[PDB]
Amino acid sequence: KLSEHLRYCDSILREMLSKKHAAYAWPFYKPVDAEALELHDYHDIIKHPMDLSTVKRKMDGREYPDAQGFAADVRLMFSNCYKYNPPDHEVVAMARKLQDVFEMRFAKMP
Numbered sequence: 001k002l003s004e005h006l007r008y009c010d011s012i013l014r015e016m017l018s019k020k021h022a023a024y025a026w027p028f029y030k031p032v033d034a035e036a037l038e039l040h041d042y043h044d045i046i047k048h049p050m051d052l053s054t055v056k057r058k059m060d061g062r063e064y065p066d067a068q069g070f071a072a073d074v075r076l077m078f079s080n081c082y083k084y085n086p087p088d089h090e091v092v093a094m095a096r097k098l099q100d101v102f103e104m105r106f107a108k109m110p
């Protein structure tokens with residue numbers, strides 16, 4: 001059941017990275033580059049950064065013991081965005097749209 005669950009998780013990650021969702025997913029493809037984005041305090045506020053490329057690296061590396069560990073990293077990526085940004089920020093709206101996809105797919109895991 002454990003490897004079966006992670007294969008389903010790997011499929012969620014594929015979907016989140018697919019062109020269908022790119023209009024809102026793209027800000028989450030890569031780690032936040034605080035210098036390049038001029039968010040120079042980002043790592044003072046966000047102590048555990050996360051992004052979809054890091055989830056992929058960890059999934060490929062078999063670092064997730066279960067689907068719950070996968071889900072916690074994905075929710076950490078959304079919560080970092082809700083924590084750092086003002087609630088009316090463009091990127092918060094994009095995070096919510098992507099989280100709507102994640103939560104639905106994750107809940108439908110057989």
Ligand SMILES: Cc1cc(N2CCOCC2)cc2[nH]c(-c3c(NC[C@@H](O)c4cccc(Cl)c4)cc[nH]c3=O)nc12
Binds near residue numbers: 028032037039086091
């Ligand atoms: C530009 C900018 C300004 C500020 N200010 C903080 C102080 O309060 C006023 C606002 C916070 C930001 N947070 C992020 C951010 C990301 N950005 C990608 C960027 O390519 C991007 C992509 C889509 C829309 C936008 Cl608007 C920017 C990606 C993931 N998580 C993030 O949190 N960008 C911010």
